UniProtKB/Swiss-Prot annotation:
Protein name: DNA cross-link repair 1A protein
Tissue occurrence: Expressed in brain, heart, kidney, liver, pancreas, placenta and skeletal muscle.
Protein's organism: Homo sapiens (Human)
Range within the parent protein: 700 to 1040 of 1040
Compartments (UniProt record): Nucleus
Subunit: Binds constitutively to TP53BP1. Binds CDC27, which is itself a component of the anaphase promoting complex (APC). Binds PIAS1.
Stated role: May be required for DNA interstrand cross-link repair. Also required for checkpoint mediated cell cycle arrest in early prophase in response to mitotic spindle poisons. Possesses beta-lactamase activity, catalyzing the hydrolysis of penicillin G and nitrocefin. Exhibits no activity towards other beta-lactam antibiotic classes including cephalosporins (cefotaxime) and carbapenems (imipenem).
Homology family: Belongs to the DNA repair metallo-beta-lactamase (DRMBL) family.
Description of what induces expression: During mitosis. The mRNA encoding this protein contains an internal ribosome entry site (IRES) in its 5'-UTR. This 5'-UTR generally suppresses translation while specifically promoting expression during mitosis, when cap-dependent translation may be impaired.
Length: 341
């Protein structure tokens, strides 16, 4: 059954709760973003109302084939009424179309559900600042002090300079970027822009990108692999074997590959800075691991929560074991004692 952390008290709303069949009492199902864990169970067979961003609605329509009658897209930064209750969608700074939702309950309680998010100080000057938030449903993916990472902009700058140097040294080099869902598009778009190229990709991936309301998208991406010097492949192919195999397929138009694996955190965040990063190499193929995160670091999460000063926190990630919940509660109490709420 639907866990209490996916239910919004004193409404019949749920959030990211599609895998439990019909939820008893639920009149509106909210979807924060188009990642498979959150949408799990949604398909062309679903027949209840789904509320979401415009981008998330495009994806539901075109990729999952959910029938149009059941998709209720809402604009961002706008007070809207859903089944008699005031809501606002805010940018989550996660992947394209990802939202946080602000729910103003009839009794006067105010609840923020973050979805998946990367906390940022620009969120301190949104509609959130206008009133007290009593309850916070929090993306606790990286809720432990070891999880540090560079800014998105540091990582992109590194990627740009690396790619530009390699292709100026060898104009027959191909650049490959690995991918497994939506998110982290700035990695491949920024590399292509410094090389004066479009991004080449499969038909399924191109169809996904065509849903995302990216300005001038038709000038940036193509299904013609031949004509482009940046290619997208599934993350699972970003290894020496898969990359030599792809190089054989391109018809001797390239004689070297430079590949990037955008990952979350991995243990080598604890010593290395982005400027010290060096690739793994075997012959004419080099693979760079780059920690481009679309989740809050510990410090970013702590700052946001200390600013917001919620009366209660409801974790939404790593809640499956008592050890994790206990550890998280410890950090929430420290933050509260330091900040005086
Ligand atoms: Ni996500």
């Amino acid at each position: 059954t639907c866990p209490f952390y996916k239910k919004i008290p004193g409404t019949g709303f749920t959030v990211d709760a599609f895998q439990y069949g019909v939820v008893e009492g639920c009149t509106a199902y909210f979807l924060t973003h188009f990642h498979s864990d959150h949408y799990a169970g949604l398909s062309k067979h679903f027949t209840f109302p789904v509320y979401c961003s415009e981008i998330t609605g495009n994806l539901l329509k075109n990729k999952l084939h959910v029938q149009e009658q059941y998709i209720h897209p809402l604009p961002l930064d706008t007070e809207c009424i859903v089944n008699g209750v005031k809501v606002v969608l805010l940018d989550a700074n996660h992947c394209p179309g990802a939202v946080m939702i602000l729910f103003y309950l009839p009794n006067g309680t105010v609840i923020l559900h973050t979805g998946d998010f990367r906390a940022d100080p620009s969120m301190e000057r949104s509609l959130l600042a206008d009133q007290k938030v009593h309850m916070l449903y929090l993306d606790t993916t990286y809720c432990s002090p070891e999880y540090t990472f560079p800014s998105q902009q540091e990582v992109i700058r590194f990627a740009i300079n690396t790619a530009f140097e390699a292709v100026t040294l060898n104009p027959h080099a191909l650049v490959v970027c690995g991918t497994y869902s939506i998110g982290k598009e700035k990695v491949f778009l920024a590399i292509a822009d410094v090389l004066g190229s479009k991004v080449g990709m499969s038909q399924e991936k191109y169809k996904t990108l065509q849903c995302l309301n990216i300005p001038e998208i038709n000038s940036l991406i193509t299904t013609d692999m031949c004509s482009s010097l940046v290619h997208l492949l599934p993350m699972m192919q970003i290894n020496f074997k898969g990359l030599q195999s792809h190089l054989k397929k391109c018809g001797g138009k390239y004689n070297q590959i430079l590949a990037f694996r955008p990952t979350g955190w991995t243990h080598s965040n604890k010593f290395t800075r982005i400027a010290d990063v060096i690739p793994q190499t075997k012959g004419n193929i080099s693979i760079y691991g780059i920690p481009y995160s679309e989740h809050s670091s510990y410090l970013e999460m702590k700052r946001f929560v200390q600013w917001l000063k919620p009366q209660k926190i409801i974790p939404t990630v790593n809640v499956g074991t008592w050890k994790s919940r206990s550890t998280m509660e410890k950090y929430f109490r420290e933050w509260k004692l330091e900040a005086g709420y």
